[PDB]
Design a protein around this ligand. Sequence first.
Ligand SMILES: *[C@@H]1O[C@H](CO)[C@@H](O[C@@H]2O[C@H](CO)[C@@H](O[C@@H]3O[C@H](CO[C@H]4O[C@H](CO)[C@@H](O)[C@H](O[C@H]5O[C@H](CO)[C@@H](O)[C@H](O)[C@@H]5O)[C@@H]4O)[C@@H](O)[C@H](O[C@H]4O[C@H](CO)[C@@H](O)[C@H](O)[C@@H]4O[C@H]4O[C@H](CO)[C@@H](O)[C@H](O)[C@@H]4O[C@H]4O[C@H](CO)[C@@H](O)[C@H](O)[C@@H]4O)[C@@H]3O)[C@H](O)[C@H]2NC(C)=O)[C@H](O)[C@H]1NC(C)=O
Ligand SMILES: *[C@@H]1O[C@H](CO)[C@@H](O[C@@H]2O[C@H](CO)[C@@H](O)[C@H](O)[C@H]2NC(C)=O)[C@H](O)[C@H]1NC(C)=O
Ligand SMILES: *[C@@H]1O[C@H](CO)[C@@H](O[C@@H]2O[C@H](CO)[C@@H](O)[C@H](O)[C@H]2NC(C)=O)[C@H](O)[C@H]1NC(C)=O
Ligand SMILES: *[C@@H]1O[C@H](CO)[C@@H](O[C@@H]2O[C@H](CO)[C@@H](O)[C@H](O)[C@H]2NC(C)=O)[C@H](O)[C@H]1NC(C)=O
Ligand SMILES: *[C@@H]1O[C@H](CO)[C@@H](O)[C@H](O)[C@H]1NC(C)=O
Lengths: 1752, 96
Amino acid sequence: CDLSGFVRPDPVIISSPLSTFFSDAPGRNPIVPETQVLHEEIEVPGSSIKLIYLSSRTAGYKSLLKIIMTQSLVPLNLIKVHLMVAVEGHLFQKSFLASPNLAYTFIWDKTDAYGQKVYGLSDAVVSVGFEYETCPSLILWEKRTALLQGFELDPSNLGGWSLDKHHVLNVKSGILHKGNGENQFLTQQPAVITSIMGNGRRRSISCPSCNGLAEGNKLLAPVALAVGIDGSLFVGDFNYIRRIFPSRNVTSILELRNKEFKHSNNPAHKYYLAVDPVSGSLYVSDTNSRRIYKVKSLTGTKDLAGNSEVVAGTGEQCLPFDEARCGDGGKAVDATLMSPRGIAVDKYGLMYFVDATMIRKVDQNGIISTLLGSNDLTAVRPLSCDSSMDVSQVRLEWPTDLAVDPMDNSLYVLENNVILRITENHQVSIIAGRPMHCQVPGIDYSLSKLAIHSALESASAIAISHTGVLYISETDEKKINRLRQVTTNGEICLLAGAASDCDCKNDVNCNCYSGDDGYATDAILNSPSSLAVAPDGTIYIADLGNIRIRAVSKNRPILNSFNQYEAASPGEQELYVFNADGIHQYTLSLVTGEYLYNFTYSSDNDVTEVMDSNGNSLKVRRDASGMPRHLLMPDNQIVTLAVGTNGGLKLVSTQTLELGLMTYNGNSGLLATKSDETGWTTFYDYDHEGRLTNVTRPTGVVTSLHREMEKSITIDIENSNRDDDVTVITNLSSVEASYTVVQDQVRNSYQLCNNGTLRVMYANGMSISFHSEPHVLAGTVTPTIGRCNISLPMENGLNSIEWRLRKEQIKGKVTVFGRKLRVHGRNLLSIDYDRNIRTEKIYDDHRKFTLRIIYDQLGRPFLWLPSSGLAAVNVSYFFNGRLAGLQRGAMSERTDIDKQGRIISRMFADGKVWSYTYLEKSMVLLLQSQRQYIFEYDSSDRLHAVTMPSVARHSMSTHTSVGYIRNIYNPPESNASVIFDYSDDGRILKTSFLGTGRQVFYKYGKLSKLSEIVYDSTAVTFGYDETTGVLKMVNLQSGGFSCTIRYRKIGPLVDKQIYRFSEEGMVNARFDYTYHDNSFRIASIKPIISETPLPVDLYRYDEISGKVEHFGKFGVIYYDINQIITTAVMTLSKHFDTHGRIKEVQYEMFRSLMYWMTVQYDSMGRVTKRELKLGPYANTTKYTYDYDGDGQLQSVAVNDRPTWRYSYDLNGNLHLLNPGNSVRLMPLRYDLRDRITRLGDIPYKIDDDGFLCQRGSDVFEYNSKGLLTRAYNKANGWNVQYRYDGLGRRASCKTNLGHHLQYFYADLHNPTRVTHVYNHSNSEITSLYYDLQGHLFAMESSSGEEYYVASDNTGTPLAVFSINGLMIKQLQYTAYGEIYYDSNPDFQLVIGFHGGLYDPLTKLVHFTQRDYDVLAGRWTSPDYTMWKNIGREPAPFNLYMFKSNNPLSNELDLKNYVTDVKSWLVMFGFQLSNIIPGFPRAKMYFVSPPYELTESQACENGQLITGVQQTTERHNQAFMALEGQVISKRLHASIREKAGHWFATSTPIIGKGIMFAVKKGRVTTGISSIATDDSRKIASVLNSAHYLEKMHYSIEGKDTHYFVKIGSADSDLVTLAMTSGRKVLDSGVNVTVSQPTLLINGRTRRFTNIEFQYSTLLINIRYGLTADTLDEEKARVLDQARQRALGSAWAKEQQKARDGREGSRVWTDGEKQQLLNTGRVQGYEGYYVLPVEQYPELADSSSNIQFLRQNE
Amino acid sequence: VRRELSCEGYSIDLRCPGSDVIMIESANYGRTDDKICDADPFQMENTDCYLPDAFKIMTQRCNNRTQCIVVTGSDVFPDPCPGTYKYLEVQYECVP
Ligand SMILES: *[C@@H]1O[C@H](CO)[C@@H](O[C@@H]2O[C@H](CO)[C@@H](O[C@@H]3O[C@H](CO[C@H]4O[C@H](CO)[C@@H](O)[C@H](O[C@H]5O[C@H](CO)[C@@H](O)[C@H](O)[C@@H]5O)[C@@H]4O)[C@@H](O)[C@H](O[C@H]4O[C@H](CO)[C@@H](O)[C@H](O)[C@@H]4O[C@H]4O[C@H](CO)[C@@H](O)[C@H](O)[C@@H]4O[C@H]4O[C@H](CO)[C@@H](O)[C@H](O)[C@@H]4O)[C@@H]3O)[C@H](O)[C@H]2NC(C)=O)[C@H](O)[C@H]1NC(C)=O
Ligand SMILES: *[C@@H]1O[C@H](CO)[C@@H](O[C@@H]2O[C@H](CO)[C@@H](O)[C@H](O)[C@H]2NC(C)=O)[C@H](O)[C@H]1NC(C)=O
Ligand SMILES: *[C@@H]1O[C@H](CO)[C@@H](O[C@@H]2O[C@H](CO)[C@@H](O)[C@H](O)[C@H]2NC(C)=O)[C@H](O)[C@H]1NC(C)=O
Ligand SMILES: *[C@@H]1O[C@H](CO)[C@@H](O[C@@H]2O[C@H](CO)[C@@H](O)[C@H](O)[C@H]2NC(C)=O)[C@H](O)[C@H]1NC(C)=O
Ligand SMILES: *[C@@H]1O[C@H](CO)[C@@H](O)[C@H](O)[C@H]1NC(C)=O
């Protein structure tokens, strides 16, 4: 049979991706979506080294190969399809029937044919056969290659787990397996180009000293290349044929007598080489001599000129139309040749060659024949673009090179910029190049990665690797000098040779030789003439133009002079040293060069000790077999390790704590369950391929991963509790790995290219391109991001950041490592480390900034020496390398530790000493004033209780609930619980105050971003753009009132901000922003308030530092750390001391001094003296401050005369003060919960939530969000109402006395800063101007008026000066901010004490999150978030005290000791955030902003759900890093922190070893081996139940969850072993079985009820038989909640009438009296404001109820 | 005393507050340090590059003025060291 023009099989082979992705925080997110890998961790006490688990480092994690052999269209005669897969000796064979879209997925167990484990990377050979109906005997075969990942090496040998810092190198496959889960496939990195022979200079024709070393050995003209069976490279060096041995030595083997020095670069004198695979014989074919030769001796004899034997040809050229057909049919020796060109030798030993325009054969017998028979012009048909025709129909025009495919055994011919293939069945087809037959319009879609669709530009040579990869040489000799690669799939790409800007042949001032010892794609080649593939896959190039032989090799670590391998991580700034076997010896600092970790092993190469730089040794105590027994921690603590019979780490524990408890799936090594000390068990489910499919948590939340492996691999990520579905699409090609992260219609693109480029194309419009370069210290083996090109969707949106690395070597050793940061060719900063003197110099390019960081003998930074005569910062360390003390001049804070490493003492420079005593899980903190704080902990170091010096005990607990983790704080002797509900990922879901019923609900949308905030009768919605994913709208809706904020963005940057209101009198606002060309810097702000355009404010910056040089009408001058704000009229000079604290302020107007202040501090930075002159002619007032034993303000003297006295409680409550200007000493009273009850004679009322309720006759109304909505005094006849935006900021203030103001926030960098004020009584806009410290200094009116404000050290306005330099207002405040003097009370100032919004009626100063009471000297509400970190950082505290009772000094923090480059730069005025895009801006907040506000700014940042998103972030963070080493500035012990777990964990109902899942409201349970019998009983009862979604409430303090079961309770009652009543389980869990009878809306119903309860957690199950059971329970729980909401609302309404307070509705005298006597009002009923149908969570909320009559 | 410095081809900006005027204290166009204004190895080859007329040029262009802008280059200053990457370093005061 003869098959001609038949459809060849074109299979699509898709291999499972390499495990390159890992998690940045395995404790926060263990899921790696793309590779479906589980990345877990176990933190161990006594060390920073963690235990890591990676699911890909197991036997169960198989290698996949999806082979799509047929498409939707099947050829007519096709009947059978055959498949062959060859991996490491295995041969899989399967036969299939012809069907559309026929595919098979091959699964590899990572073993060889002998059943032994295969490590690293393997090559798979896929063969697809097509059997036609015309011929059943013959099958059309096609061979393709695929890369499969084998077994990963296990360095640590700890039951499948590894030590965080312990790595291993696979020497054969070139893979770095890091202990943290990071895999670096070094061979997959950009290919390296090196010179293996030649020096760019010509040798003499005689070849003197040609027998020596290959490197640098002079060549003449390399025209031909061929690799021998030995691995030797035969070089056709024009006159001589030279053999390069694997020992890198050269010996001349043959001399060609017909070669002359003149014809070196002549194309007529070009010859071709070929090696026979049978016997290593080298064949030579000279076109000029018209013959073919064979080298006799490959070692080289004495007579080199006669070391050849004639194979074919006599020497005479035969005519094109020869009668005898140039001797065909007879012996090759006797035959004549036209012009022999390229030669190739078959697998069987058959020799093929190009003879002018035909292919001729020379068989084993020596008989010459013709394969591609010419002169048959009639039977010749023009070249078919799609189909494959026989040899007889093919005509060759100018053929040159020839090569055999070592995989196919097919012949490849290079013919007139087209590569053709001759199969063993004599079938010809186009493999690469576009002929003129179908040039244009042959293909309508134009550009594609296929070789058939890509045209060849002046091709010169071809080579085929053993993997069937074709390499094509292209030389124009001018600009095109490149090497292209054609993979088995038929894709073409550039392998070597960048496009040269210069002409190599014509231009005299040209150098076409570069890129050597670097990356191949960056290198510039010159006239490549021949190619050859080495056994290891390296490609040799005969670079004729540069008289060299260049090698394109796989990126690999090279054995150094010490017989060691070196790899590095630039992101971690570490260098790893391995022995000849790839075993981890040391970890050194890539910057410092100091040893960080030393690894010592046992006799069996099992790691036994990890020794850090500080002398901390983590010993692994092992058995003779190498089995781990336990870990001996640096503090001599024993961590017990139990390895199961399956070989998996079963238990990790201390003498008290159970750190980890694990179970695995058989012998696969796949982690099935993982438990901790709290009893929290996570369940992991995998498919038969060992890919993670489900992750189930005790909360009932299931994370599901679904894989669809087609032409592109798609992974779908779903969560049972959210609608945030994320899908990752992966497209792997020859050029790049293309990733697309999809969230609805929001698509983010990621491209990991072969050249080392990482490209991100965000949905917002911004694109980032990271470019790799070989590291200056570690070489080509480690690519580093040295360039970052940013693009914004605007006119001049191109930005560029660069890192320029350098080195200084003295006697071959690294002395200095320099790094320079550049923006658009300008140096901004340089960080250089000198290893000889151990100093790190950080310096500016213009003599403005200089910082030296001194490192000790252990390689730790200990001294910071700044410029401008500033106080140096120095630190102390303990033996274990932990920070002991800190010092900055006269200021110091030291600590002392236990033998256990616990802090026992804390010493301050003023002599203050705190003692820490440890007694049975409790720690007692005692101060010298004998004030005592007791902190009671868990075994997990989480707070149980806190006892104050007043002996009042506060209690806390944390518990796993249904869909979240509940955190409860209970005040002393109170049931008024404060609850913070968090999701499994650590996001806030609900904030509850059980005292009055205050609730804030947080909802998350499809983009996994904040979508809704619900509190009381208010709903706040966050709208995002459907395509870009950016925050477009923020809308607050409270009944009739609507406040909308709208944004327009240029990528992630705001260019427009709109304020819109639904109210009648309220005015709207618009702010237009422009950005400076090629930057992220704001250039202008143009406001439009009430359709009245205001003047534009221009911003000018220093391009080298980011310093604001001009803002509005104000100019800024910087000298050292001091600043001057200037105008033609005013000059504001700010002087700072050596500690960076303000020492002098000078305010001049019209060259006259208006205001001056001088501040003096003690050793600890407390304000001790303040001198003030308010006005040009006024006297100077001196204020002196004295502090008590605890640093609390004791007294204030005016001109050395005592005026104010302050005294404090044991709890720090201010219980004695001189109010305002008074000489009289007034006492303040407090309850057990530290809430104020009286101030002198005035009574105070604080509600059960901790919020200010009343101050005498003043009534304050705080909402669920903690915002003051209304305040009034009936006796004084005043009322004030406030409105807020969706971000929690005050939008308006309106009084009953005529006052009405509106506030606007135009500053994008300071979103809580009031920039504009609209006054309704005069319709004028006031522009507020703030200095570099954030203090108000100037004002501008829309009327044309200008005001100049004198503000103190805290930002408090003390005086106002007019446009003509006249003091119009002067204020005098007490230390706690109470005004006692005002020269002009009619001049209304918006900003008051500490920069906040002061209200003269309420006497409260507003800050976006908290309100401050000036009369009491405290906050009006507690900050309950203090409880989250008080356990980790124990210190004296009070929930209400203001600035630790030191109101005039900056709050004492460890941030006062400057130990980081970014913080030192901020002091000097530098703003790196303005010059480096994405760099974090220094926070300028006194009061922390609300959650939604900080979230609205950070939502524009790239998501971190997928592995490619985390890879991108690593690239970004490593690029922003400044110091080579950063210190851990913490004077407290490290605590193991869990997501959403704040306090001591309560015993769960869902026990340890129990699986619990809630999918679409349906309950499913599972059981593991460790689960107790009583825990299995609860699981059995809860299985198949239906959860009442969104209908869970806090009833009588109980976290109640409702469930239903369709059937009988009989089966479950047998399980519980009870009939009725209450039963207590071994865990302590209460089981209550009852048959209640409920009356719901007239209907009577009786049912069996099973209730599970522990502490506040309550799980309720209702039994029924009908289908309406779920609907009946839903109607029952909503009616019971409606009764609670109505019961509470009427009670609160009755209480308002009793107290004499204003009610929710206006009641008549009769209605009010009816409410007082009965409790209800006739004709009136409570109705929901926000519908219960859309908001079922507010069903029991009294603040969502309104009283209305039937008239509506 | 106030200080300004700019690398070759870049302008130097001098500004005084209100009605105060510039007075040049010292000036040099050239190279006196090996770390100032980073460039190729050829930059640090000469740290003794001085222009005596730099003081005179700055004095004439900036004295008695509220503000001054001068470009660090061949258009305003002669070349004291061809081949070496230069900078303009100035010390000045603001006087009535
Ligand atoms: C929102 O918009 C609201 C507007 O819709 C806005 O409310 C308005 O705010 C302005 C500015 O604060 C208010 O104006 C002030 O009114 C003061 C009250 O004085 C009245 O009573 C006196 C009798 O007791 C009358 O003599 C006096 O008559 C004057 O004003 C008439 C206009 O109504 C005019 O026809 C007369 O000829 C006469 O000039 C008035 O009826 C007033 O005292 C105050 O003036 C001072 O403040 C100005 C700057 O704000 C200075 O420029 C001016 O010179 C005044 O300063 C003097 O007094 C201060 C207080 O005592 C001192 O601190 C100063 O040092 C200075 O004192 C020297 O001079 C005195 C003589 O001038 C002398 O006696 C002293 O010994 C000393 O030598 C100003 O005009 C206006 O009332 C408010 N309007 C309304 C309708 O409500 C609101 O504030 C806005 N809110 C926000 C947040 O922006
Ligand atoms: C910072 O450096 C100072 C030296 O300037 C250290 O002060 C010395 O501390 C020792 C105790 O270790 C005293 O005996 C010396 O009298 C001090 N030296 C002098 C004369 O100043 C200081 O300890 C360092 N601070 C920290 C916290 O490391
Ligand atoms: C805190 O404790 C109080 C008192 O024990 C609880 O209030 C009682 O609640 C029941 C049932 O709702 C009512 O019948 C009583 O009239 C209430 N007592 C009074 C007079 O207040 C309150 O529910 C508890 N709250 C929490 C958060 O558990
Ligand atoms: C199981 O139920 C019992 C009885 O309802 C709970 O015990 C009571 O707890 C309160 C508060 O701690 C005490 O004031 C009572 O004295 C206890 N009553 C009795 C009769 O024991 C018990 O706390 C429940 N178990 C859990 C862990 O929630
Ligand atoms: C390689 O050549 C050098 C001369 O350059 C010679 O000294 C040496 O012995 C040779 N080494 C080998 C591999 O035999």
